[PDB]
Symmetry: D3
Subunit: 304 residues, 6 copies
């Protein structure tokens, strides 16, 4: 009744999930034609099944999105009973408002595409902005890495009881004050005027940079400089979505991060070989549980 399928190539997360549920991943013939078109073939009947498609990480977002959309649609027209898109890192999430510009709200576009492709339900982790749930008319379960991160901080930072949770930018304020509050420690915020300004106290205390995602890590790496200058004992960076593209990985080594922690919502095994300070929090149990619970009509909020 429950069927789990994976996006192209990136199967490690999807395999971890299927394992925890006692299932094998569904058969699918996924490829790319010589001329770049996404080719998909669901290799088994999904008629009347509860289907979960777990998003791939070939690091080509548009190919990954089209592949997801094609699979949702194939399952829908093959009379699956229900189709859930499981999308740990939601594409174009950062493009969720116009911001004074004549820009697309791409995240709303993506929501509409998933909807028209035929998704009945979304499962995702740490949406860039919670309002993104408002982009759908179908139910969205938005899981949080927060509890997994708190656990890690307490269990890996000896001075965590007097540390400071720092936001790389102005927008990240709500996220850090939530974490700092849970830990009962100080928070501080960085703003790029360029010159970086710091408000709050970091002097003679462990500083933990917390952000939802880091791409090129330009901001996260400058942030670490400023924090050192301001007398931070040691600096950590915690990101739930480790995109780490471009100069990201080199800047990280070239920076003073005692460590950089991410979840495996994006595949990290390649980069970990090229970056010693990276540690991954496995989130496959959270996702498996959300699927199992979604499937059984059981409470998901429990994982929040």
């Amino acid at each position: 009744n429950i069927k789990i399928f994976s996006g192209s190539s990136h199967q490690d997360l999807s395999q971890k999930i299927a394992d925890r549920l006692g299932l094998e991943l569904g058969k699918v013939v996924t490829k790319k034609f010589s001329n770049q078109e996404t080719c998909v073939e669901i290799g088994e009947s999904v008629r009347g099944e509860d289907v979960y498609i777990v998003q791939s990480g070939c690091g080509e977002i548009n190919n990954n999105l089209m592949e997801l959309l094609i699979m949702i649609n194939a399952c829908k027209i093959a009379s699956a009973s229900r189709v859930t898109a499981v999308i740990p890192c939601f594409p174009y999430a950062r493009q969720d408002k116009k911001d004074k510009s004549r820009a697309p709200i791409s995240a709303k576009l993506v929501a509409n595409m998933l909807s028209v492709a035929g998704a009945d339900h979304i499962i995702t982790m740490d949406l860039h902005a919670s309002q993104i749930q408002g982009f759908f008319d179908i139910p969205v379960d938005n899981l949080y890495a927060e509890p997994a991160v708190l656990k890690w901080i307490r269990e890996n930072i000896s001075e965590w009881r007097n540390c400071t949770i720092v936001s790389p930018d102005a927008g990240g304020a709500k996220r850090v004050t939530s974490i700092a509050d849970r830990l009962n420690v100080d928070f501080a915020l960085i703003h790029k005027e360029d010159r970086m300004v710091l408000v709050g106290d970091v002097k003679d205390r462990v500083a933990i940079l917390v952000d939802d995602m880091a791409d090129t890590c330009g901001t996260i790496c400058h942030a670490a400089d400023k924090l050192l200058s301001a007398g931070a004992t040691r600096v950590y960076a915690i990101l739930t979505h480790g995109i780490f593209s471009g100069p990201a990985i080199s800047r990280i080594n070239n920076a003073c991060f005692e460590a950089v922690v991410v979840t495996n919502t994006i595949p990290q095994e390649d980069k970990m070989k090229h970056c010693s300070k990276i540690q991954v929090i496995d989130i496959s149990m959270i996702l498996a549980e959300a699927i199992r619970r979604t499937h059984n009509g059981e409470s998901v909020s429990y994982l929040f």
Copy 2:
């Protein structure tokens, strides 16, 4: 081709906008029946017209909201060419996410209601969260009070070049840094844990609390005290939307504000009689200009940084 209607009763804003466009407000037969049901009847043909309906202010939200939806509906089935909802302060805007709860995203519900009623276009001012534009599939013009605010600051606060812009909560960080950067001054931030923590320097500077909206004012009042305790010379509060429900006017009369500045997106006239700290920025010209441009197909973005 252009036609402007007012929701019920608080017709001031509606009248100021119509005046600035050279128009009379359209005729409406708009009562509430014995059982509390909204009555409407568009008293003139709107056939083939570019219709703008301005949300009425009497502060009873569900009535104002239903009245607006009914008028949108009425104009659409009477074959208006286009129907734009002009909603200076967007209802249920503070209900735009789940916040780890089994809650409605009521702002999305409101957007869906406006959509099915038949709105083709929305004009609003300072959405509580910009993502709310993402709640519609029709175009939304979200005007800013910032240019009018920056102007008020520069012309009313002698020490503006040395002031600090302060957010009363963590969620207002981007809004205040944006103002601080434009003015080229400092910003600070208050975070409520039953205590407030302040980060950023305010000592021996004028502090300006800037928020999108103030309701019961519990927060801004405590923020002022906190700011004075941290050494602020004096304290201003500048809100775009002055809801001021319940005990707010009493909290303001007693608070250590030098002044509380709000726009007239929400009617303030009666509130001002009981509260001398309240000053009002008129935003009718910005709304009037957004309507005029929308109707002409002219750039509306000009107003995002420019007071007309």
Copy 3:
């Protein structure tokens, strides 16, 4: 699997319904903020449940409608399996046509709002016009109070065998001729030219004014005058929806109604203290049965 929730404050009907089904009403934190906005919080998981929201009667129709809409939506995005709005008295039902005016069809608006809020199913009683079922694309079960009213007439009017069922206006013709036919008695109709005209026979016979609803009762009260003048032995008024707002309750005492009968689709307990002639027909069993039967895939038409 079945979950029943009530609208704000008005719980008496909703409680009667939940009792007959052997259920407790679902937990919900409903309130109104200082600034008039409707605040709702579903206080329990409704995931995979068959949910019925029974409409409140705070007598503020717009607050009651918004509260209903918010609750439907909250249940939908919390992955309820099905959401039914149970709405004994359908708001804006009288606004169901333009009637030569440039008016809204508000009842169609309300249907659209409920639909977009995410209702899968409607249960209602005595719609002002049956065409209102046409306003939805989702199924509507429109229950009738007719059988409950016939029972009451036979059991409370000694002369019912030679009485006359009278319609207050021209529009109510179909409703009364149906009742008069079932009873095998005379019907008559009133029209407001103002001066009231009466067609049909009422002389020396019990006259029963039957209407779907009465608000201010101005029409129902003038009607009773005319009927007396025309030689009605005694006059009764039967209304399925007793709104009774404004001068309604006083005009009723000030009128010659042997009695005024209503159902409890709208809360009547307050007004009954202020009006001796009012008697209520409990319709909670009809509604409970419709819910139970809706839930079990059992026939509802049986109650018609």
Copy 4:
């Protein structure tokens, strides 16, 4: 910009409307294939045009209906600027509620079909139930035959000032009281239980049976007898839509009507050859005027009480 097309065949009404607008009917290649499928091909560009399609009358409803939907479809995907369905007599209108049965609301189905085919606007005359406007989300203009009827009465019935307007059923009460009030005369009402009961005074007065439509005429014929038995001097029947299917023309030839008056919303020419009681009010001017106004963005409500 204005373009008018006729459904199949009964092109009279369509031609009268086009004539009154100064137009030729648009070219259509419109046959029915060997297997009973409708064929259409719009014989001219409609790109960017204000298109009106007038429903054809041949009385085979499902064919007329499918033909209309296919032409709506054809014009929309050929990029017409707007497509209006002109449907003098609305199909399945008597199927607009469930009536305590497991029945379709076929009129709602028809509305959905017209909508998905791509109609932007509907123009119709005397919907069987006004609520049918509520079946669409697009605007509907529901024109009335009343002004044309009132005029016919005043000019053809000497005793109109002392007549009685009579509804043949309980469902027509509002329609007849409306006419009676305007004329300032009496109204009465027939209710069929296998017997008819009459309420209201008709004695020694001319009785005018007024209904929205007559089909087999079983009812109006029995109503006439009933009215004469109650002392009516003579009896008229005035319908807006003269369906007259099956044995109707035979029931009319034998009935005690002085006259049976219908509009030409349904073609009557062939029926009149076999029935001398039938007179026809031409409604093409009302339709022509509704189209002209719709196209110009001019008030259509004027016609609700005013014969053009």
Copy 5:
């Protein structure tokens, strides 16, 4: 749980289907009023049932389509759990593109009508063009008569091992080369320049004209002439949809067809009396199986 209903009058197929499933056909009061309007009344509760409406064949396509639409809608508003339209021969299928003209895409119109009427699922046989499945957003199971036709050819044509499958027109190429390939025999194609051109080899070999449907049979009958002229031993015509309207039946006798084979997707019993060469392949088992399998969440592709 499974309920099967039939379109008007034409019950033979629908009865065959209901038999194979061990069911009686559902009660429905279907008729045509004096004034041509389709009258339907579902004569039993379908609440919570899995409903299949099998399309009638009164040979009046518009009446058959409206009747189907009305029945789908009636079941939907009576809270059927699921409604499938079973439509062996899809109306307006030949009107599925503009073809350089200002024509309707009627097949898309029909798809939209069925969808808005409330169909959840379509079952059909040999769509004129497979892209027609693209006209729906709901699942379509498109059954093939191909296997039934191959069986018949092998079992009724002695020379089938060296026969030629011939397409009446250019458009039918894909269909015949598929059949010819499966049989491992020759294919040929006819084109109307009018004068008919033939490409491919038919000399001294049994020629089988294969087409998805034949209406007036003008094309199929001229085709047979040309094939004789080209030295075809004997000519057969195989059509899955035998419409056979107008001069069709007479032209067939007047032609040299050793036989004309059709399926019973359209009622053939009347015409078979007037045409000796007609043989029907019963497809009621294929349809019953597709319904049963659709109902049980079982694989349908198996029948392909």
Copy 6:
């Protein structure tokens, strides 16, 4: 009122079309962020404008497709009056049926995506299957390369009056018979079973392979050999869409074609440097004319048989 934008980068076609209309391409800020996400920002107001977005050619389909959808989206919420997607070669067009498999109908998915993004109109050239117009509910103009092809043949092949038009597969039958009939010449057909069978006469005639698109060219290359073996004097291949991915240019350099003719619906400039057999028909005038007509409300059908 008319505004033309180009997708990313392969801006040639876009520029040729804009040139022919007398326009400059609209300003776009269009990059791809570090993580492969498409960036767009319409660099000018499109408010109230008739917007045409021309699909960019860089051949990475999912990126081109997402870029197009994002720009459609951007223009619609910036209140463009209308947004038309100009998609010379329609993506996933070869995925427009199930083919007895559990496959997506990806072309229908693409249509749905274009629709929800907010396209009001599509302009395309030679859809792989005409039924694809049936995948949209908005109007689609599917232009033909045939008139330009017929012209190329008549002016470049001396023996065109005695040539044979050949389909490389069973699915192209209608397309080649259509060309053969117009030219009044023969047609033939290849069907791949691992072998090819040819039906129709090509002996001692020039053979012209005509297809909608060529990708890896495996098929057309084998078809040429087959055609020469059957006695064709020489062999041409004429495609509307020259995808030429993977080993195609190498298959062409080695194949027995006299010439391979393609339109510029797909950019060919770089491909031509490595392949001297390739000639290019410019279709920018046809696209330019379809846009101009669409904007003016003028007949577009003229181009279906007439090279502008």
